[PDB]
């Protein structure tokens, strides 16, 4: 239940259809900042 008095936290709360814990805003943050084995450069 999201009866938060009208406040909408859906953009900061976890998104179940996201990388398993990350909200929309965390996804935006993680997309605005930029094991190599031995056979990946061989």
């Amino acid at each position: 239940i999201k009866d938060f008095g009208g406040f909408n936290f859906s953009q900061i709360l976890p998104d179940p259809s996201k990388p398993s814990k990350r909200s929309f805003i965390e996804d935006l943050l993680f997309n605005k900042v930029t094991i190599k084995q031995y056979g990946d450069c061989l």
């Binding site: 094991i35 084995q37 031995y38 061989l42």
Partner: protein, 86 residues
Amino acid sequence: LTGTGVLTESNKKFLPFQQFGRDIADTTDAVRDPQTLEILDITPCSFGGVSVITPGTNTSNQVAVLYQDVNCTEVRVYSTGSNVFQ
């Protein structure tokens, strides 16, 4: 030119006046075979950090070994076995 590493058949545009390449650290990267003229890269040998996880020596002297950032293929009792985790 002496060195240690793996030689791999590659494809680099070597003009017919060059002999070997150079990495950004001024280290050889690819060489053209003096006889079977082929520009083959020189990659350093398979290296990997090795950390030793251990409980207190007093408690026991059994340890685990973490090979850092290597797939569980390249890697004596702690080299293989049925107790390997990726």
